[PDB]
Amino acid sequence: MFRILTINPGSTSTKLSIFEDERMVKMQNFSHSPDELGRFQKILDQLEFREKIARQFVEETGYSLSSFSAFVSRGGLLDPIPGGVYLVDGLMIKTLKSGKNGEHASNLGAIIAHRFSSETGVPAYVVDPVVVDEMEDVARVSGHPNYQRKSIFHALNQKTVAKEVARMMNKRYEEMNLVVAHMGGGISIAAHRKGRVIDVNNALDGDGPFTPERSGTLPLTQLVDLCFSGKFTYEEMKKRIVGNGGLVAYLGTSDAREVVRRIKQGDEWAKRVYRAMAYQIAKWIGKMAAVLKGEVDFIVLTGGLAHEKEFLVPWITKRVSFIAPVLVFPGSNEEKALALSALRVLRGEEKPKNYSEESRRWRERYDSYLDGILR
Amino acid sequence: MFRILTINPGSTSTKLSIFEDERMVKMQNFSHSPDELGRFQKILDQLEFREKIARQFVEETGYSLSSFSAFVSRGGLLDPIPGGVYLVDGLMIKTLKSGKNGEHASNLGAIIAHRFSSETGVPAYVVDPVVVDEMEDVARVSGHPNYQRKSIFHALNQKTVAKEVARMMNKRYEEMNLVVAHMGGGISIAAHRKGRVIDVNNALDGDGPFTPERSGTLPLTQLVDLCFSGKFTYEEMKKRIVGNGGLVAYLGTSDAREVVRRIKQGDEWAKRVYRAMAYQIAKWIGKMAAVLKGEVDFIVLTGGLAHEKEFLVPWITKRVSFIAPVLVFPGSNEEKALALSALRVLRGEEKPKNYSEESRRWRERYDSYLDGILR
Ligand SMILES: Nc1ncnc2c1ncn2[C@@H]1O[C@H](COP(=O)(O)OP(=O)(O)CP(=O)(O)O)[C@@H](O)[C@H]1O
Ligand SMILES: Nc1ncnc2c1ncn2[C@@H]1O[C@H](COP(=O)(O)OP(=O)(O)CP(=O)(O)O)[C@@H](O)[C@H]1O
Ligand code: NA
Ligand code: NA
Numbered sequence: 001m002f003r004i005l006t007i008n009p010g011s012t013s014t015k016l017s018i019f020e021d022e023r024m025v026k027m028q029n030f031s032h033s034p035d036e037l038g039r040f041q042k043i044l045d046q047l048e049f050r051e052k053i054a055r056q057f058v059e060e061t062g063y064s065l066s067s068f069s070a071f072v073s074r075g076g077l078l079d080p081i082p083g084g085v086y087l088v089d090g091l092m093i094k095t096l097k098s099g100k101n102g103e104h105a106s107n108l109g110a111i112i113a114h115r116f117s118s119e120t121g122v123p124a125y126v127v128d129p130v131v132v133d134e135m136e137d138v139a140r141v142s143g144h145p146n147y148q149r150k151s152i153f154h155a156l157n158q159k160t161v162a163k164e165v166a167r168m169m170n171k172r173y174e175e176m177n178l179v180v181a182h183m184g185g186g187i188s189i190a191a192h193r194k195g196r197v198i199d200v201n202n203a204l205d206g207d208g209p210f211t212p213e214r215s216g217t218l219p220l221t222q223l224v225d226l227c228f229s230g231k232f233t234y235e236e237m238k239k240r241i242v243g244n245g246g247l248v249a250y251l252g253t254s255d256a257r258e259v260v261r262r263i264k265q266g267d268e269w270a271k272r273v274y275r276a277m278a279y280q281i282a283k284w285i286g287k288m289a290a291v292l293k294g295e296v297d298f299i300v301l302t303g304g305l306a307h308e309k310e311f312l313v314p315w316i317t318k319r320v321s322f323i324a325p326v327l328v329f330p331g332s333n334e335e336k337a338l339a340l341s342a343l344r345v346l347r348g349e350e351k352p353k354n355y356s357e358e359s360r361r362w363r364e365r366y367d368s369y370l371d372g373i374l375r
Numbered sequence: 376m377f378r379i380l381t382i383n384p385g386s387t388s389t390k391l392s393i394f395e396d397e398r399m400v401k402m403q404n405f406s407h408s409p410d411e412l413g414r415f416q417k418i419l420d421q422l423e424f425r426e427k428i429a430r431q432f433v434e435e436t437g438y439s440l441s442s443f444s445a446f447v448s449r450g451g452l453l454d455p456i457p458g459g460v461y462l463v464d465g466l467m468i469k470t471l472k473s474g475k476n477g478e479h480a481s482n483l484g485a486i487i488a489h490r491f492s493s494e495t496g497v498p499a500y501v502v503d504p505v506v507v508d509e510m511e512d513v514a515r516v517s518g519h520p521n522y523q524r525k526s527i528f529h530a531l532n533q534k535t536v537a538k539e540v541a542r543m544m545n546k547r548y549e550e551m552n553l554v555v556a557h558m559g560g561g562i563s564i565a566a567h568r569k570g571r572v573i574d575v576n577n578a579l580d581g582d583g584p585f586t587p588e589r590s591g592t593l594p595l596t597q598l599v600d601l602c603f604s605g606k607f608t609y610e611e612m613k614k615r616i617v618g619n620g621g622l623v624a625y626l627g628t629s630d631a632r633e634v635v636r637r638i639k640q641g642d643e644w645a646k647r648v649y650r651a652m653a654y655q656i657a658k659w660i661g662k663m664a665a666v667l668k669g670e671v672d673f674i675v676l677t678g679g680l681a682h683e684k685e686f687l688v689p690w691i692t693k694r695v696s697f698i699a700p701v702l703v704f705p706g707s708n709e710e711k712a713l714a715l716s717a718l719r720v721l722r723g724e725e726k727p728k729n730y731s732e733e734s735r736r737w738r739e740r741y742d743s744y745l746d747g748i749l750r
């Protein structure tokens with residue numbers, strides 16, 4: 001019986017849970033109000049504030065941090081790496097604290113687990129960071145030398161549902177081909193070729209179909225124009241990619257249930273914009289089908305939007321069932337996903353990756369690719 | 376027997392030809408050197424220069440402009456309109472001369488035909504302008520209210536090959552479903568649903584797969600960043616979408632035959648970038664397949680790149696034949712295409728559209744769509 005602690009720091013919340021083997025024994029979401037949050041200049045300044053909530057969470061359990069077998073955290077903005085469960089080390093910490101790859105609340109998670117680790121000797125891990133990158137070189141070329149397509153998406157949910165589909169039919173994730181569509185506030189559509197995400201859109205940076213809250217890919221010219229059109233507000237213009245865009249920008253809401261209600265009342269602009277979102281998701285799924293050369297076992301719809309079975313799901317299904325049957329796996333459980341990955345490691349069913357080495361192996365391969373600087 | 380004159384003004388050249396029914400009797404390309412061309416401030420200033428070449432072309436024929444039955448020109452940057460053959464009228468001229476929709480050498484063609492028309496009484500037409508737009512509303516939504524997907528591509532070649540495929544099997548263009556891929560210096564991939572191009576990428580404005588000379592769609596964030604990174608050269612940064620991008624930017628050449636030669640010599644970066652271009656064309660064809668809900672009769676590869684049957688064509692075919700069989704229709708004949716469209720009209724096999732009315736009908740429909748300004 002292994003007792004595990006999962007750490008999941010988000011932009012506006014902090015989720016923690018305790019697992020005893022595969023059974024969850026405690027979980028609590030600690031939301032943070034804009035007020036309470038704006039009290040910090042840089043994101044790193046929240047470090048002690050959030051650690052305090054975690055120590056407190058275990059504290060009022062009667063258990064001590066040394067009674068745990070592992071501490072597991074959501075990855076963060078680490079350098080590109082293959083999927084898997086990594087041991088938190090010195091290089092990871094240095095990178096996270098220096099925000100060399102950007103600052104994000106999720107970076108605090110690994111740091112927090114590491115300290116819990118230095119005080120108890122218990123192992124700390126991070127699994128499937130948002131920077132998981134397992135794509136093929138051909139997918140990196142963008143059309144212009146000083147631009148690269150990068151793999152930045154909800155890799156944890158992707159990998160997790162893919163393995164769930166396999167396990168459901170007692171097959172191996174490694175022997176299938178899938179098109180998995182994670183449709184939440186962010187939308188990533190990935191091509192899984194034999195356990196490897198060979199191509200996917202850069203969801204986190206706003207590339208792809210538009211979402212309930214993001215605008216997704218936008219017209220090039222019209223952009224470079226409205227770019228320096230005086231309307232320049234590096235911030236304002238920058239929030240139209242991850243904050244103020246998509247359904248919320250057209251209908252004034254990012255709640256699908258609200259939008260479906262309107263469609264049932266005869267709202268035509270609402271239905272036209274919602275239908276356009278499904279239309280885009282379908283197109284991208286088509287892109288990924290072409291990536292797999294048509295060899296697709298299943299198309300999987302997952303994420304919050306997969307719950308909407310009256311319009312969205314049926315619309316997508318009609319357009320893409322010619323590629324492969326459609327399977328719906330609604331939602332996503334980050335806590336359970338992280339704890340199980342740590343259990344597999346503790347049970348010796350999976351080998352822990354070493355971020356340090358693993359990062360070098362990746363950069364070495366990427367650097368050989370990047371050697372296109374030869375004129 | 377109808378004698379027709381075709382006018383085709385390009386960025387750096389001017390092509391004219393004379394058809395007597397379906398037989399071509401004279402054609403000549405008048406290239407214009409950067410020197411000879413830079414002699415004009417605005418594009419409109421070339422008007423008299425190019426008209427002089429056309430009058431001269433007919434001049435040394437022994438024929439007079441009044442012996443013709445029609446004058447046909449390549450469309451230009453007119454307001455959005457459905458496909459077809461239009462009669463050149465006052466509204467078209469006003470729009471072209473004022474460059475309200477942008478300046479382009481192709482705008483001079485209609486103007487030149489109109490004058491030839493005012494002097495002889497003979498009818499002047501423009502067919503399938505680059506601004507043909509027959510897409511469905513759902514395809515217009517971009518993800519953000521002040522951005523629209525527009526249909527701007529090589530509509531003449533598109534429409535022409537589509538009808539050729541049909542005629543080849545004695546069927547009607549109006550009763551088929553096709554995915555036509557025009558792969559030249561510009562790459563447009565369009566979904567033809569029963570004679571109507573319901574969706575296609577904005578090729579002319581750099582949206583889509585990268586081409587031998589254009590970069591195509593680029594990463595959003597990385598763009599908005601490099602946008603105002605001091606490197607700002609509204610011009611320089613603007614030519615990385617239609618002039619300096621794509622294969623030419625990576626390999627230093629936009630000649631596919633040159634690139635194929637390198638691949639045969641073992642060049643690996645060359646092969647990797649070329650293969651990435653095919654890879655992208657395939658993905659977009661996948662997008663259009665999803666637009667047609669999988670109901671695709673044929674996938675058609677046309678344009679210059681369709682000539683390359685050693686690598687490009689076979690690579691695309693492998694990835695997309697699961698959608699529908701692939702047909703290769705290399706090149707494109709603009710002269711023959713324009714003259715035939717005028718012959719059909721002169722023979723009464725096709726009705727001439729009226730740009731004036733046709734433009735209103737289009738804007739009325741678009742304006743109802745654009746009424747999403749209701750909060
Ligand atoms: N039962 C339900 N019916 C219809 N829509 C639902 C739903 N439950 C959730 N949604 C919708 O699905 C969307 C996504 O929820 P999800 O939990 O995946 O998003 P997220 O807020 O966590 C952001 P991201 O996906 O980028 O992490 C929501 O924005 C909501 O509009
Ligand atoms: N026989 C051949 N074999 C291989 N490639 C060829 C070819 N003939 C032409 N090409 C290539 O195909 C590409 C397109 O020629 P195409 O005539 O369609 O282009 P274009 O210069 O007219 C520009 P656009 O398509 O935007 O009008 C060229 O850029 C060239 O590299
Ligand atoms: Na978008
Ligand atoms: Na591109």
